[PDB]
């Protein structure tokens, strides 16, 4: 019943310091730092990895990072877990998931 | 009170000459003496069943739904012996009580009387099982000459407006009670907290008059403003500002 975060490098170091991270050596870590040289597939499986986990309640992800995995989160049309789009230091929150109305 | 009454045991030809004997003394007391007569014709629906027996006694064919074809004349012969004249100051007023069967207003007894008379008063069954004593429903019952009958020269200045508001606040009171069961008793609106308590006070304190409690028109509107003590001013949109400023503060 914990929070997950994708974010970025500077995002995940603030939210781990907030106290949301958990290291499950059995299954997986509950976070994923994305650097400049991370493939979109690695963000794609980990989005599906967090979605299939039962204990994940929120999936925090920067919209600047969620723009390339927009097609996968537009297929997620369930209520739980909630995906949230947070601003980066470049290109803040504009047009994500208020587009249902 | 000049009562005369016809049992079910009594011959059914006497049930036809009973409204004929009713009005011909009630138009002797109103058009030959100068009294104000009020005629009460109970069990009207039992009168037309006594019209069906005599019409089928002379071997006529029936009409629509069993009652004969000339029933719109025979009802209008005894409904339209009313009104008041210009030569005298007498008057005669009719309240024909009739029971429509199976709650059907399309039945020819409560339909042909809706074309001769001047507006209905609707006793309801759902109010009666809730056990307020006079089951008079306010929504489907309108008086046609209600506008002419009230006023400052007649009974009171605010009677034309407090009757327009008591019905209107009861109308918004009704769907609020249906709203209480569909969302919840507390989370609905701050507006509907106040209409819902008035309906408990309109049902029990105003239209639940007791079995022997007499109540004048001045005693009625005093309860009419006691219920409008609730809904503070500029919520009552129908009452004009002149008569609202006079009667509401007390």
């Amino acid at each position: 019943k914990l929070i997950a975060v994708i974010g970025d490098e500077d995002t995940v170091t603030g939210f781990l310091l907030g106290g949301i991270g958990e290291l499950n050596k059995n299954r997986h870590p509950n976070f994923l730092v994305v650097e400049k040289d991370t493939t979109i597939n690695e963000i794609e499986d980990t989005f599906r990895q967090f979605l299939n986990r039962d204990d994940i309640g929120i999936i925090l992800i920067n919209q600047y990072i969620a723009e390339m995995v927009r097609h996968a989160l537009d297929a997620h049309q369930r209520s739980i877990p909630a995906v949230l789009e947070i601003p980066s230091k470049e290109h803040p929150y504009d047009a994500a998931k208020d587009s249902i109305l | 009170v000049c009562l005369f009454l016809n049992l079910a045991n009594d011959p059914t030809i006497e049930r036809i000459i009973t409204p004929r004997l009713a009005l011909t003394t009630a138009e002797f007391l109103a058009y030959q003496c100068e009294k104000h007569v009020l005629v009460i014709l109970t069990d009207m629906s039992s009168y037309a069943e006594a019209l069906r027996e005599v019409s089928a006694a002379r071997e006529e064919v029936p009409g629509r739904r069993g009652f004969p074809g000339y029933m719109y004349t025979d009802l209008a012969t005894i409904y339209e012996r009313a009104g008041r004249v210009e030569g005298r100051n007498g008057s005669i007023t009719q309240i024909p009580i009739l029971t429509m069967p199976n709650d059907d207003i399309t039945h020819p007894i409560p339909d042909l009387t809706g074309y001769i008379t001047e507006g209905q008063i609707y006793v309801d069954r759902q109010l009666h099982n809730r056990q307020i004593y006079p089951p008079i429903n306010v929504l489907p019952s309108l008086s046609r000459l209600m506008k002419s009958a009230i006023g400052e020269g007649m009974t009171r200045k605010d009677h034309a407006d407090v009757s327009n508001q008591l019905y209107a606040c009861y109308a918004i009171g009704k769907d609020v009670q249906a709203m209480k069961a569909v969302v919840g008793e507390e989370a609905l609106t701050s507006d509907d907290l106040l209409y819902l308590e008035f309906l408990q006070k309109f049902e029990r304190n105003f239209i639940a008059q007791g079995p022997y409690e007499n109540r004048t028109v001045y005693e009625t509107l005093d309860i009419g403003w006691q219920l409008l003590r609730i809904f503070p001013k500029e919520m009552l949109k129908r009452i004009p500002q002149s008569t609202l400023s006079e009667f509401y503060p007390r």
């Binding site: 019943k1 914990l2 929070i3 490098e9 500077d10 995002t11 995940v12 170091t13 603030g14 939210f15 781990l16 310091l17 907030g18 106290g19 949301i20 991270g21 958990e22 290291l23 509950n30 730092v33 309640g57 929120i58 925090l60 049309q77 369930r78 209520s79 739980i80 877990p81 909630a82 995906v83 949230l84 947070i86 601003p87 230091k89 803040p92 929150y93 998931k97 208020d98 249902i100 109305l101 | 071997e59 064919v61 029936p62 629509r64 739904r65 199976n102 059907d104 769907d175 249906a178 709203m179 569909v182 969302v183 919840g184 989370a187 609905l188």
Partner: protein, 212 residues
């Protein structure tokens, strides 16, 4: 489409079926309207707070510049000694219009993990970065409690506005044009007995004048 046999007592049954389906729509109309009013003001609360977190995530991430600039680099220390979570979620249950509603509750418990971080250089630019990101995660679990409340209402308003439009356009005009069929089928038997009874009225006269 006609349902059953006409011409007695099915008219009163269908008038009971119509009256239940008439206010059954209006009851479900007020349910779908109060759900939409709950949905309309929860949209503006999403709007006014999703720009508000854009300032908080700009203020707290500004404190990240107020952060390792003083004290080294927090990019490997904090991502290598985490085992358990400090702030967790508890799935509570809200309710509107009889529909169960998922809502997330803030739950901080158990321990600290970056209690000893910095501590010789910095540590005051840190642990106010914690407070800038404990308040940020406090706001973001409230918005996640509405993000999972937003999309569960549009699954319960669509399966309600169909049932309004199923009663209004299918069930009631099937009952209404059935009730118009019981009326005429009553009438085609009320004039059929007017022909049989008038035939006897003429045959009672012809038999009479044969006697006279």
């Amino acid at each position: 489409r006609i349902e059953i046999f006409p011409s007695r007592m099915a008219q009163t049954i269908m008038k009971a079926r119509l009256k239940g389906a008439q206010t059954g729509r209006n009851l479900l109309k007020k349910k779908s309207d109060a759900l939409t009013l709950r949905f309309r003001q929860i949209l503006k609360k999403i709007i006014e707070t999703k720009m508000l977190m854009g300032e908080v995530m700009r203020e707290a991430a500004f404190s990240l510049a107020e952060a390792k600039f003083t004290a080294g680099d927090f990019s490997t220390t904090v991502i290598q000694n985490v085992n358990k979570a400090q702030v967790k979620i508890r799935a509570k249950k809200d309710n509107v219009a009889g529909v169960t509603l998922p809502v997330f509750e803030h739950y901080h418990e158990g321990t600290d993990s970056y209690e000893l971080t910095g501590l010789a250089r910095g540590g005051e630019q840190l642990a106010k970065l914690k407070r800038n990101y404990a308040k940020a995660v406090e706001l973001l679990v409230e918005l996640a409690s509405l993000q999972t409340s937003f999309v569960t209402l549009d699954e319960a308003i669509k399966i309600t506005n169909r049932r309004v439009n199923a009663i209004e356009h299918v069930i009631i005009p099937r009952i209404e044009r059935t009730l118009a069929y019981i009326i005429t089928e009553l009438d085609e038997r009320e004039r059929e007995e007017f022909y049989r009874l008038k035939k006897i009225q003429e045959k009672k006269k012809i038999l009479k004048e044969k006697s006279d």
